[PDB]
């Protein structure tokens, strides 16, 4: 599971 | 920016 917020 | 990989 990969999550990114930028 | 939101990125999800499951």
Numbering used by the authors:
A (entry chain B), B (entry chain A): 1 to 6
What does the paper behind this entry write?
Two polymorphic crystal forms could be grown from solutions of APRex-4. In polymorph B of the same system, shifted interfaces could be found which are stabilized by different interactions. A lateral shift between adjacent β-sheets allows the formation of 3 different interfaces (S1, S2, and S3). S3 is stabilized by the hydrophobic interactions of the Leu, Phe, and Ile side chains, plus the intersheet Glu–Glu side chain H-bonds. An aromatic cluster is formed in both polymorphs of APRex-4. At pHs where Glu/Asp side chains become protonated, charge frustration ceases as side chains establish intersheet H-bonds. For example, protonated Glu forms H-bond either with the opposing Glu (S1 of polymorph A, S3 of Polymorph B in APRex-4 Fig. 6c), or with the indole rings of Trp(s) (S2 of Polymorph B Fig. 4e). Polymorphs formed in pure aqueous solution are laterally displaced, as the side chains of Tyr, Glu, and Gln rather form H-bonds with the surrounding water molecules. Aromatic side chains form intrasheet aromatic ladders in the two parallel structures of APRGLP2 and APRTc5b (polymorph D), as well as in both polymorphic structures of APRex-4. Interestingly, exendin-derived hexapeptides showed the greatest structural plasticity that is reflected in multiple β-sheeted conformers giving rise to several polymorphs.
Here, we identify an evolutionarily conserved hexapeptide sequence as the major aggregation-prone region (APR) of gastrointestinal peptides of the glucagon family: xFxxWL. We determine nine polymorphic crystal structures of the APR segments of glucagon-like peptides 1 and 2, and exendin and its derivatives. We propose that the pH-dependent changes of the protonation states of glutamate/aspartate residues of APRs initiate switching between the amyloid and the folded, monomeric forms of the hormones. Our results highlight the dual role of short aggregation core motifs in reversible amyloid formation and receptor binding.
